[PDB]
């Protein structure tokens, strides 16, 4: 179950990835949602550690209680890299939903002959065993493929 | 693979881990050294749960060094980088890493003490950052770190 409600928040992550692409950044966006369904924070890509998932981790730590964090959900256009996955787990954030996996992205970068990142594309549960993780979203594969192609294709 | 010069900087990381323990933090310390041998920055734990000295060094190196100087710099650390720090180091393009104890030793020790496993897996650095040159652990500092980790996480 990627629910219909989840898809609504993933589509929004996708629009943030587009917004970042248009302002000259890498196409990645994420959205922190509280247990209620209220969007608490939103971000997108922008130094090389400026990942929206990490920004969300630092934000959740600064502005939420351990208890509220644990009940929050993070949606993301692209599965967290190991930095973000670890940060999320260290601050005690809850569920993660992603539209594309770092497996799909790594496959695609290889297809385009693009430089592999200096960080391995580990699935989240390899880095953070306790986190509940849903995705990818079959509905948004082609869109993300196209978005990633705009930035990284070659 | 661990030189005498490396050990001097690891001993210094250990004293920072001590300093952190004494001021009520987790016993972790790290030291950023430039290609010359000049210490550029030093830090230790401050738990915000992401306040890891290795990460602080990554953000610092990005803010204050050139891609070229970063690549030629060495980071020493009392305890092998967690996946967050290991990834951050690789994303900013830092150089060699030397550690006094591994996350394997630490994870073994926490299990021995019946202590709660961390919410992040103890991945070796090269699992997270394949390209980084990594030296350690240091047999000379095992018992010391064991004792120090025991103070915070066993006792
Ligand atoms: N997973 C990820 N990878 C990169 N390069 N940039 C961001 O923002 N996230
Ligand atoms: N790797 C690591 N793990 C913990 N708990 N605390 C710090 O500072 N570093
Ligand atoms: Zn990331
Ligand atoms: Zn760390």
């Amino acid at each position: 179950a990627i629910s219909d409600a989840d898809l609504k928040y993933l589509r929004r992550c996708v629009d943030l990835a587009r917004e970042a692409l248009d302002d000259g950044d890498e196409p990645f966006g994420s959205v922190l949602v509280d247990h209620t369904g209220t969007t608490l924070f939103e971000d997108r890509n922008r130094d090389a550690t400026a990942h929206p998932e990490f920004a969300i981790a630092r934000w959740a730590a600064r502005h939420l209680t351990p208890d509220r964090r644990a009940r929050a959900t993070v949606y993301t256009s692209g599965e967290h890299c190991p930095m973000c996955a670890a940060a999320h787990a260290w601050v005690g954030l809850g569920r993660i939903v992603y539209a594309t996996s770092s497996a799909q992205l790594g496959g695609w970068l290889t297809e385009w002959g693009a430089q592999a990142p200096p960080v391995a594309t580990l699935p989240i549960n390899t880095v953070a065993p306790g986190v509940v993780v849903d995705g990818p979203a079959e509905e948004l594969a082609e869109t993300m493929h196209n978005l990633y192609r705009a930035k990284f294709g070659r």
Side-chain angles (χ1 to χ4, degrees), chain A residues 1-3 5-7 9-18 20-33 35-61 63-67 69-138 140-153:
Chain A
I2 291 168
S3 81
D6 293 326
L7 229 51
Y9 291 108
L10 283 177
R11 274 162 168 114
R12 177 57 184 154
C13 291
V14 172
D15 296 320
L16 293 166
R18 208 169 285 98
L21 193 71
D22 299 347
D23 187 42
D25 282 296
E26 297 180 324
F28 294 95
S30 296
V31 164
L32 176 58
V33 183
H35 57 278
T36 72
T38 308
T39 298
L40 303 174
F41 187 64
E42 296 190 330
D43 207 19
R44 31 86 8 143
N45 183 276
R46 315 176 179 286
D47 97 305
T49 76
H51 289 201
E53 302 94 330
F54 189 79
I56 286 164
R58 280 261 152 118
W59 191 93
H63 294 70
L64 296 175
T65 69
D67 186 64
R69 293 205 285 270
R71 301 162 195 274
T73 299
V74 175
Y75 296 87
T76 193
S77 53
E79 173 168 29
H80 289 52
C81 79
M83 192 179 73
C84 297
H88 177 113
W90 282 123
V91 310
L93 280 157
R95 182 160 167 251
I96 287 172
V97 192
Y98 61 74
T100 61
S101 55
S102 50
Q104 294 169 283
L105 175 57
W108 293 332
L109 289 182
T110 290
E111 287 171 16
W112 302 319
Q115 188 176 170
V119 176
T121 54
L122 303 177
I124 291 164
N125 284 137
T126 298
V127 179
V131 174
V132 187
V133 175
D134 287 316
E138 269 90 47
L140 311 173
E142 225 195 46
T143 306
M144 286 311 293
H145 196 174
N146 296 336
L147 269 194
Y148 285 136
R149 181 176 308 101
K151 192 72 202 199
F152 297 127

